[PDB]
Amino acid sequence: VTSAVGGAMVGETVEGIARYPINLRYPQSWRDSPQALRQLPILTPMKQQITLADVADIKVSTGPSMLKTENARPTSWIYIDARDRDMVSVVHDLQKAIAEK
Amino acid sequence: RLAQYGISLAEVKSALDASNQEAGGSSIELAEAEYMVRASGYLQTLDDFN
Amino acid sequence: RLAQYGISLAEVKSALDASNQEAGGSSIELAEAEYMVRASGYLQTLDDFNHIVLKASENGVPVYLRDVAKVQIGPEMRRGIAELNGEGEVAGGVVILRSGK
Amino acid sequence: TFAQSFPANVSYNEYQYAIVQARAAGFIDKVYPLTVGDKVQKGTPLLDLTIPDWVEAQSEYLLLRETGGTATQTEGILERLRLAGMPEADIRRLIATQKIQTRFTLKAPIDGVITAFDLRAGMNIAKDNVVAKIQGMDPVWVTAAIPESIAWLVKDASQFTLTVPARPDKTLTIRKWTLLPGVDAATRTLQLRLEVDNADEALKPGMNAWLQLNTASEPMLLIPSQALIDTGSEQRVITVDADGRFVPKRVAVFQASQ
Amino acid sequence: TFAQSFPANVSYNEYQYAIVQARAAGFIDKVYPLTVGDKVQKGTPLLDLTIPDWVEAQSEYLLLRETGGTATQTEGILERLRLAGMPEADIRRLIATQKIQTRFTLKAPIDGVITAFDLRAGMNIAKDNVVAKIQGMDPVWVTAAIPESIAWLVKDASQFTLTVPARPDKTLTIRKWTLLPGVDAATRTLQLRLEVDNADEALKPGMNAWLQLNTASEPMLLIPSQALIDTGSEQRVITVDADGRFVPKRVAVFQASQ
Numbered sequence A: 001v002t003s004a005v006g007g008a009m010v011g012e013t014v015e016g017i018a019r020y021p022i023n024l025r026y027p028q029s030w031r032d033s034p035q036a037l038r039q040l041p042i043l044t045p046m047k048q049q050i051t052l053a054d055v056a057d058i059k060v061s062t063g064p065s066m067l068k069t070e071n072a073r074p075t076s077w078i079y080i081d082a083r084d085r086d087m088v089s090v091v092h093d094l095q096k097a098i099a100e101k
Numbered sequence B: 001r002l003a004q005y006g007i008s009l010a011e012v013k014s015a016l017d018a019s020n021q022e023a024g025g026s027s028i029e030l031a032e033a034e035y036m037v038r039a040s041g042y043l044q045t046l047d048d049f050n
Numbered sequence C: 001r002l003a004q005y006g007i008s009l010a011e012v013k014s015a016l017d018a019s020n021q022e023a024g025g026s027s028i029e030l031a032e033a034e035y036m037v038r039a040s041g042y043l044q045t046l047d048d049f050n051h052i053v054l055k056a057s058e059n060g061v062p063v064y065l066r067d068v069a070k071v072q073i074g075p076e077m078r079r080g081i082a083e084l085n086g087e088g089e090v091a092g093g094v095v096i097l098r099s100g101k
Numbered sequence D, E: 001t002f003a004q005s006f007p008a009n010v011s012y013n014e015y016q017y018a019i020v021q022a023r024a025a026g027f028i029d030k031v032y033p034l035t036v037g038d039k040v041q042k043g044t045p046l047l048d049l050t051i052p053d054w055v056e057a058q059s060e061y062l063l064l065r066e067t068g069g070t071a072t073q074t075e076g077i078l079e080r081l082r083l084a085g086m087p088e089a090d091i092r093r094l095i096a097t098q099k100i101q102t103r104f105t106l107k108a109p110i111d112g113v114i115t116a117f118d119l120r121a122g123m124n125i126a127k128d129n130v131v132a133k134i135q136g137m138d139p140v141w142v143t144a145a146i147p148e149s150i151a152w153l154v155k156d157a158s159q160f161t162l163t164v165p166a167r168p169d170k171t172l173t174i175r176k177w178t179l180l181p182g183v184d185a186a187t188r189t190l191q192l193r194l195e196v197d198n199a200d201e202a203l204k205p206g207m208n209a210w211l212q213l214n215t216a217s218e219p220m221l222l223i224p225s226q227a228l229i230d231t232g233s234e235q236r237v238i239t240v241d242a243d244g245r246f247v248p249k250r251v252a253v254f255q256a257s258q
Helices: A034-038 A087-100 B009-016 C009-016 C046-050 D055-066 D071-083 D088-097 D148-153 E055-066 E071-083 E088-097 E148-154
Strands: A009-015 A018-023 A041-043 A049-051 B023-030 B033-039 C023-030 C033-039 C053-056 C062-064 D002-020 D026-031 D045-050 D103-107 D112-116 D132-147 D159-163 D174-184 D189-196 D208-215 D235-240 D246-250 E002-011 E017-020 E026-031 E045-050 E103-107 E112-116 E132-135 E140-147 E160-164 E167-174 E178-184 E189-196 E208-215 E228-230 E235-240 E246-250
Touching (some): A009 C009, A049 D132, A049 D148, D002 D112, D002 D148, D002 D189, D055 D071, D132 D208, D148 D189, D159 D174, D159 D189, E055 E088, E071 E088, E140 E208
Antiparallel strands (some): A041 A049, C053 C062, D002 D132, D002 D208, D026 D045, D045 D103, D112 D132, D132 D189, D159 D208, D174 D189, E002 E208, E026 E045, E045 E103, E140 E189, E160 E208, E228 E235, E235 E246
């Protein structure tokens, strides 16, 4: 998952002052999609040729995108863009609409 | 049972140490969306230990 | 090629991890001078990658990284993208000032 | 149309298989410049050997030829020779020269590669000794390994395509293919054997070979993959109306590939 | 363009191969100062043995000579002798001495190295025992392991440069060699065998060697490797047309080098 499918860094070249990442990975073809992942080739320790689906279920799901915390409480920010009116009037109206509905 | 199964205390310890972490497979693009490849692997049930 | 050569992904990773460092043999006195024993070993050519040894028969016929992998120079995962005037991707730099100066 | 790639081995043709053994005991007179690894053609001399077993019955024939024995009496002794193991051609040499045959030359029965050669000069030879194991490679075999779990991916109507990394300049023609009855327990893979033309002898046994397969499924509704949104609990597509309005619709996914 | 150094080994000439076996059973009278690893020359005594198989027929001959049997009666018993396994040199000793031969000497058929010596003093001997396995090394053998991937290239190679670490002065250009029809499966390598004159015994079987190849292919369409956008199943390049617009094109790769 980390190296075959994902391209996890494995080391870095040392080129003078600079450094550059080195990594292992299957060609994109084998990791194109879910189904592709289910047929991801695995050479087991006992030289058995299996697929990733032989040892795992791959399910698509939905969950956290990025956890935003403020003083340790999760929070979502609603970005409003009003530029024709004056500010205070807008917020005072938002406070009403929000309160009642 | 260690002797009966031919398994050393050391082998047990190492096995444990490899059965309790998650791993990321980066992401993969589907429908112009980013799909985070997440691999389970945390101990959380007694059965998982077993 | 992993299966065809009987080499596991893990073996590849370990081999890589042993083919990219220098080492000192201390020094040795010659003509009342100090000779620093320096041992090469840094990756610096694509060919160096290709010749990462994975396996060797009693024969002396070795199996190289090149036998199970293609070593190419590609882009790392972009964490940020910069575009100029809507007609090209570019590399940029931003100077950041010490707060209060 | 499903598409997947499997690794395969170029291997000797096991229907072109010969193991030469001396028809009777004797001793090696000469062993030709040959060793395991060498390619021989049909007719190539392997070795010369002396075989006494047949001489007694041979002379018994030659003197019945002298004392004008009957055809029935002469043929009978020849038949004893054939059953005694004596090669028919060596029997023909007997009749054509009326000379007792004592030194013989074993030749390669077929074209192929020597994989065994247990006899060298100076030895005695026995009926169980193998003088030469010769394996052919013209209709060369190529066996591909399919993980048991994807067995379903291979059907009769499947379309195969072979490539060998060692010869990018060649396009292989598959004579025929078979899905062997059992799976290799050691690897947990089905065995798919291909017979491939190889008169140029470009395909050497031991070579790697990639087997690309295509397989058509039952007919289903087909859309590009980028067109499908999957949130793990539902899959949908965005449909374009007659007016150009974008209206979403739920769909059930069967499978996907390529 | 290619510049590769292939790994190679020095080994015995398998066309200079001898396995000395006794023509008939018996017991060892004496084995000479010799063992596995020793260099022997044609004629070197290996061991003395007693063989009672031929004595009865030898008498039959000597008796025949006492009573002046037919010339063909003598040729007869004499030919049954050589068919019985008795060496032609020992038969000559029979007629010359007119005494029955029981004690014989087995000598080395060729020059070379004893790589097997299964008989010592006080032992009996059988026909399947090997008294000496001798393999020569004057025209010594060297075999290089060339990665299958460039079979397409080496099938037309002109020359290589053989070099051995143990001997920096025995480095010579190689213009004749044979590319065996089999490739090692464990290393997926072609096997190239070549002979090398070796009177001074400078090259010893077991030594490491290097086979150097500096060559160029036949002209082909070339592009910088960086240019090839190759997925696992799709290789293609971005072409810049006349106006400078991008246009992805599917291509078919032959092979990359340097």
